[PDB]
Amino acid sequence: GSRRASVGSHRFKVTNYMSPTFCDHCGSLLWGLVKQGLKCEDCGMNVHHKCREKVANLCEFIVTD
Amino acid sequence: GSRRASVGSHRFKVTNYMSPTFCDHCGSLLWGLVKQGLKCEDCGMNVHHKCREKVANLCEFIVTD
Ligand SMILES: [Zn+2]
Ligand SMILES: [Zn+2]
Ligand SMILES: [Zn+2]
Ligand SMILES: [Zn+2]
Numbered sequence A, B: 001g002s003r004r005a006s007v008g009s010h011r012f013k014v015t016n017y018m019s020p021t022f023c024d025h026c027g028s029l030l031w032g033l034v035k036q037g038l039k040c041e042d043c044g045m046n047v048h049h050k051c052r053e054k055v056a057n058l059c060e061f062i063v064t065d
Helices: none
Strands: A005-009 A012-015 A037-040 A058-062 B005-009 B012-015 B037-040 B058-062
Touching: none
Parallel strands: none
Antiparallel strands: A005 A058, A005 B005, A012 A037, B005 B058, B012 B037
């Protein structure tokens, strides 16, 4: 048997975080109070602008529907 | 770049076909007027009962959302 996974590449979008949030790539704070970084619209990964260049494109999540 | 695909295993359900439908595995008609075969709830593959055990479990389709 297998989980069903959605498998593609990240789709990052600039995001306003309402609480202090860290980069899921590098571990440093997403600095500031607005437009602090990017969130993948598919898997929710949060990254700095600079870290968008550094993450693997692979984007997977388990479909729990 | 990558398509987004849903990737899991088939989820076959006994199906009452309304029009003449063929087995996507073996090519023979799904005989009868009711419960003629099984349809995968995820990818739509149609199979005879006997062909359910002959198909690969792999079930993928492109997410066009
Ligand atoms: Zn992602
Ligand atoms: Zn970072
Ligand atoms: Zn399937
Ligand atoms: Zn068949």
